[PDB]
């Protein structure tokens, strides 16, 4: 599924992400845009054997299990395949754990590079939320 910007903003709001660990809704929409271009099926293989999954590009070295990295961790206690669903719940629930780890949204590289220090509220402007 490729979400529309405003469609995703609404779904993220419904999932309680607005102001979650202090990050306004625009931050979350912007992160999805640059991490996955709003695509719930997005995957990216990394040099360590791990894979980034789904709309928020969550890494299998730490957060989910895909079997392909023996001794890796699964801190969200889910199969990585759950992060490729057309509904965002599993990704959002896992993302909540990630952002609560102690370094905020900096754990998302594309958020740091493309969202942090920008007018993130632009990503939700003009949506009827």
């Amino acid at each position, epitope marked *: 599924k490729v979400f529309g910007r405003c469609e995703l903003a609404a779904a993220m709001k419904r999932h309680g992400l607005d102001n979650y660990r202090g990050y306004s809704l625009g931050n979350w929409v912007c992160a999805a845009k640059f991490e996955s271009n709003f695509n719930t099926q997005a995957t990216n293989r*990394n*040099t*360590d054997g*791990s894979t980034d999954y789904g709309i928020l590009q969550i*890494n299998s*070295r*730490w957060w989910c299990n895909d079997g392909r990295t023996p*001794g890796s*961790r699964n*801190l969200c206690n889910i199969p990585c395949s759950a992060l490729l669903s057309s509904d965002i719940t599993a990704s959002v629930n896992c993302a909540k754990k*990630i952002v609560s*780890d*102690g*370094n*905020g949204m*900096n*754990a*998302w*590289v594309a958020w*740091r*590079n493309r969202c942090k220090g920008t007018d993130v509220q632009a990503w939700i402007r003009g949506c009827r939320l």
Partner: nanobody
Amino acid sequence: VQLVESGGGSVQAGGSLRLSCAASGSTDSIEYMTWFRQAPGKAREGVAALYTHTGNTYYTDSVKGRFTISQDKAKNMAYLRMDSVKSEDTAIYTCGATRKYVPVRFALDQSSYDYWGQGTQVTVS
């Protein structure tokens, strides 16, 4: 990513020594820069980790209060200042880094790190 260590060598007990690590390539993709050490008879252990995008720091119990990890992010530099050094600090010190986030609970584990410097001997008298 190449990590280039400098500093080290001999130091007296209760004294101070600064180690430096300079990171190759662009500043932006480095996540953690973290000093490890390996002492006579023991495995490599995490000493002090720094998350470069917030400045947050994490120390092993045996150095809390005596060692300080810090950075100059613009230069891809990380520093370890050892104050109040003790015999147990004698070890080979190596800086590691990652280009992907690592949960804080694993930030002092060597298996978390993908890039390493040379090792720099520190000896406490």
